[PDB]
Amino acid sequence: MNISDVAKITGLTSKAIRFYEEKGLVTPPMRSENGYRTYTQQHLNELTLLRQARQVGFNLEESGELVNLFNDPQRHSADVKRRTLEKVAEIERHIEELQSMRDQLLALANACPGCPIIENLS
Amino acid sequence: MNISDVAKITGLTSKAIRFYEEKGLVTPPMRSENGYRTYTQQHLNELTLLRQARQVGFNLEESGELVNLFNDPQHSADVKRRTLEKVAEIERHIEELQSMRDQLLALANACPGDDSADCPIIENLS
Ligand SMILES: [Au+]
Ligand SMILES: [Au+]
């Protein structure tokens, strides 16, 4: 496949695909007799993984490590699990933060008719 | 007040304060006899609103619009409206993080968590 198809299939922008290549986070694409990029199911898997890991909160470095673990035939599922539970703790904190912001906005909204909001924000 | 005083009082950097002005998000300050910016309590109020609006979820334009409403002599329900949409947006964000947490905790529970290569987490993420 060419980069365009890989994009449509993975839900990543060509920009992003080329980016992960520049960072060395995914297996480089192959070059054809013409000098253009072609990918295989293997590249599709690595990129899919990378996309979903970013979606669930993993940053770049971590996402790359997951690709490494993915390509490691002798990976320890325990290592992946520890990383996943750590990531869960972070998501929990992130949730607590957003909840704290939501309560403050709701308080401001409560004290308002149809302006405490603006007055207290400045 | 000069720009440095405003920075100390609001906690914003002088670069940030110059940025807000450059983007017309706040009222431009006047000039002193020597050509330096002079601020008034109105500037402190706009910059504070802007800093707190951002800290509580609003983006730049939304913050700029909140500042425009602030300066208006007249819109209780026009702000309560914006405020409540920002809350709906946050709740949706919370809903999404919760969903990712549960999904990761489901995969982790299915994980052997041992020295074998079989891994449901890696498998259902790639
Ligand atoms: Au209000
Ligand atoms: Au696992």
UniProtKB/Swiss-Prot annotation, chain A:
One of its GO terms (molecular function) is cis-regulatory region sequence-specific DNA binding. GO terms for biological process: DNA-templated transcription; positive regulation of DNA-templated transcription. Residues 4-23 bind DNA. Keywords: Activator, Copper, Cytoplasm, DNA-binding, Metal-binding, Transcription, Transcription regulation. Transmembrane segments: none annotated. SMART domains: HTH_MERR. It comes from the Bacteria. It holds the Pfam family MerR_1. Disulfide bonds: none annotated. One of its GO terms (cellular component) is protein-DNA complex. InterPro entries: CueR, DNA-bd_dom_put_sf, MerR-type_HTH_dom, MerR_fam. CDD domains: HTH_CueR. It is found in: Cytoplasm. The keyword Ligase does not apply. Disruption phenotype: Loss of Cu-induction of copA, forms smaller than wild-type colonies when grown on 2 mM CuSO(4). Residues 1-69 form the HTH merR-type domain. Cu(+) binds at C112, C115. PANTHER family: HTH-TYPE TRANSCRIPTIONAL REGULATOR CUER, REDOX-CYCLING DRUG-SENSING TRANSCRIPTIONAL ACTIVATOR SOXR. CueR tightly binds Cu(1+) via a linear S-Cu-S center. Homodimer. It contains an N-terminal DNA binding region and a C-terminal metal binding region. Regulates the transcription of the copA and cueO genes. It detects cytoplasmic copper stress and activates transcription in response to increasing copper concentrations. This is HTH-type transcriptional regulator CueR. It comes from Escherichia coli (strain K12).
